[PDB]
Amino acid sequence: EVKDLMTAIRKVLKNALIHDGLVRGLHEVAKALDAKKAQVCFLSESCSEPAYKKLVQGLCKEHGIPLLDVTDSKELGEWACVCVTSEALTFLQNHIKTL
RNA sequence: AUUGACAGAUUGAUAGCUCUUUCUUGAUUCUAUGGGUGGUGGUGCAUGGCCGUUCUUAGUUGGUGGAGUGAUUUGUCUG
């Protein structure tokens, strides 16, 4: 392809595990939210639990830091529920803060 | 998936071992099959290495030659 359609997810989650700042699980993502820690978060397009889907959005609504979407609840983490405490991020960064 | 543990229970025990309960741990481990791993388990009558004893004594081999069909002997001897 001509450039790369959303490899800003897969490039960063490989290379961030040099420094080790990826966080996994409902407890630990919630603890990463309830903290001075989490910088970007994710959820499934469709997971289950209206509250569960809502809670992720709701927790973010307090202290900021958005979600996006991605695809398939099995194939979220396999590029590495996600938390993350240039080059790859240039596609994401302009989408997150600005429009 | 596994872990740390207060105050009671229970226990000699301020070992959360296991609990009546309910907070936490974050892929190190658990679950089973194969296979490893470890032991002051057994065998010194499977062995190594070391020590004692035969032996505190003076003794012990093979080379060539001689004797004997041979085991062996002579050398290693009467004094």
CATH of the domain at A76: 3.30.1330.30
CA of A65 to C1' of B6 (A): 36
Name the strand (E) or helix (H) holding A68: none
Protein-proximal positions, strand B, CB < 7 A: 24-27
Contact A6, A50 (CB under 8 A): no
Closest nucleotide to residue A25 (Cα to C1')? B26
d(CA A23, CA A70): 17
**Residues of the domain holding A67:** 1-99
The distance from CA A12 to its chain's CA centroid, rounded to whole angstroms, is 11
The tokens describing A96, both together, are 């997150």
Closest nucleotide to residue A28 (Cα to C1')? B26
Q: How many separate domains does chain A show? A: 1
CA of A22 to C1' of B27 (A): 14
Q: Which residues touch strand B (CB under 7 A)?
A: A 24-25, 27-28, 31
User: What resolution in angstrom units was achieved for this structure?
Assistant: 3.3
CA of A15 to C1' of B56 (A): 82
What is the distance between the terminal CA atoms of chain A, rounded to a whole angstrom? 24
Q: Tell which residue, A75, A82, A95, has the closest CA to residue A43.
A: A82
